[PDB]
Write a protein that binds this ligand. Structure first.
Ligand SMILES: [Cl-]
Ligand SMILES: [Cl-]
Ligand code: NA
Length: 129
């Protein structure tokens, strides 16, 4: 599913991401925009053989099992395919674990390089929330 901007903001808010660990909703929308272009089905393979999955590009070395990342962990206890669903629940629940792991949203490279320090409230402007 490719979400619209305000549709994704509303879904993220319903699932408790607004101000989660102190990160306002626009941070999460901005991260999704630049990680996946709001597409739940996005995948990207990394040099180390891991793959990033879904709207928040969650990585198989640590967070989910894809059967093809040797020596990896599955700290979200899910198959990586669950992160591609039109229902964002599994991605949000896993992202809550990631953002709690010590480095905050810096775990998402696109957030660090393209959202951090910018006017992220712009990403929720005009939305009925
Ligand atoms: Cl957009
Ligand atoms: Cl933080
Ligand atoms: Na894994």
């Amino acid at each position: 599913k490719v979400f619209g901007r305000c549709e994704l903001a509303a879904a993220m808010k319903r699932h408790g991401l607004d101000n989660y660990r102190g990160y306002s909703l626009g941070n999460w929308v901005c991260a999704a925009k630049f990680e996946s272009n709001f597409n739940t089905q996005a995948t990207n393979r990394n040099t180390d053989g891991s793959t990033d999955y879904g709207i928040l590009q969650i990585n198989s070395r640590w967070w989910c099992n894809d059967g093809r990342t040797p020596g990896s962990r599955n700290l979200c206890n899910i198959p990586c395919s669950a992160l591609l669903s039109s229902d964002i629940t599994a991605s949000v629940n896993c992202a809550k674990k990631i953002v709690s792991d010590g480095n905050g949203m810096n775990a998402w490279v696109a957030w660090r390089n393209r959202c951090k320090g910018t006017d992220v409230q712009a990403w929720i402007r005009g939305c009925r929330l």
